[model samples]
Target: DHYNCVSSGGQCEYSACPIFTKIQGTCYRGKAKCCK
Candidate 1:
């Protein structure tokens, strides 16, 4: 299952997986950053 975090800001508002670190913001033009 994928985690649902905020996608309108530059912060991750959800829990993350241990396998990956911070998520890339390329998907939304750096509007949001989360853990992948």
Candidate 2:
């Protein structure tokens, strides 16, 4: 599952990209915005 948010009790989450770890939610025009 590409780009699928994997959450294990909201503590353990693994993604293809480390940057994805920082991306809490959706982005804008390929621009990553900080999640609130």
Candidate 3:
């Protein structure tokens, strides 16, 4: 599973978040990481 959300600018807004495992490249650009 993953926790994904839209990032602001080129960075993620979530504080102390883990490194993104993947970055959505289609329409909705966002970051993703392993769910904790």
Candidate with the greatest lDDT versus the true structure: 1
lDDT of 1 at 14: 41
| TM-score, every prediction | 0.21, 0.18, 0.14
Runs in model 2 deviating more than 4 A are 1-22
- Model 1: C-alpha RMSD to truth? 8.3
User: Can you write out model 3's per-residue Cα lDDT over 1-36, one digit (the tens) per residue?
Assistant: 122333322323333434653433322233333222
Cα lDDT of model 2 by residue, 1-36, tens digit: 113323321212233334434545443333443232
In order, the Cα lDDT scores of the candidates are 0.42, 0.33, 0.32
Which candidate has the top score in TM-score? 1
lDDT measured at residue 3 in model 1 versus the true structure, 0 to 100: 32
Q: Is candidate 1 or candidate 2 better by TM-score?
A: 1
Q: Write the per-residue lDDT of candidate 1 for residues 11-35, one digit (tens) a residue.
A: 4524442464666443344344454
Candidate 2 achieves a global lDDT of: 0.33
Which 10-residue span in candidate 3 carries the lowest summed lDDT? 26-35
**Candidate 3 global TM-score:** 0.14
